[PDB]
Amino acid sequence: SHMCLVCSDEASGCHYGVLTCGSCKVFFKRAVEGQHNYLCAGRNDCIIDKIRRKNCPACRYRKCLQAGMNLEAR
Amino acid sequence: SHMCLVCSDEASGCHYGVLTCGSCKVFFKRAVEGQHNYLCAGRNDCIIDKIRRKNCPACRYRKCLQAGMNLEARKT
DNA sequence: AAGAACATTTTGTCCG
DNA sequence: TCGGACAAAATGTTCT
Ligand SMILES: [Zn+2]
Ligand SMILES: [Zn+2]
Ligand SMILES: [Zn+2]
Ligand SMILES: [Zn+2]
Fold it and tell me: What ranges are recorded for DNA binding (chain B)?
């Protein structure tokens, strides 16, 4: 289809199992491969759009997981 | 408390009128000069502390202004 | 589709 | 106190 399931920007393909833009693709890989310690400054329900996805990596990562992203998709 | 009034990190001086840390000092200068247009992804009430201050420039910048930071603190 | 390298943006430290 | 340069972290794009 058309839109990233994580941030609603234009998708570039099906990455890690889910339709996402390229920025969310590489965010999720880095998140999964790094150490998890992200902390929301809100209530763990930040809105994640094209502009606001840079705000909260904790909620952006929860949204990647909720969308079903996983490194071993293939 | 030698604490930054914006994020509670260790303050380094009175910058632009307010006891703040090095990071909040330059963040504030950068926000006004670029006349930045920040948007909160919460509720306009994010927690701003040493770690989370990176997460919402909108609430960080709001706390700066509200604490009374002002580029013309001296001129004043 | 996915990984890597390059690029950019955003933030933070150190001087003077 | 304040500014500049440098440095680092965080995000994003191109893969001639
Ligand atoms: Zn996305
Ligand atoms: Zn959040
Ligand atoms: Zn501060
Ligand atoms: Zn906020």
Answer: 4-69
Helix (H, G, I), strand (E, B) or coil at B65: helix
SS3 of A18, please?
A: strand
Q: CB pairs under 8 A, 24+ apart, for B30-34?
A: B31/B57, B31/B61, B31/B64, B32/B71
Which bases on strand D have an atom closer than 7 Å to a protein beta carbon? 1-5, 10-14
CB atoms within 10 A of CB B50: 14
Chain A residue numbers with beta carbons less than 8 Å from the beta carbon of B48 are 41
Resolution rounded to one decimal, in angstroms: 1.6
| Distant-in-sequence, close-in-space partners of B43: CB < 8 Å, separation ≥ 6 | A42, A43
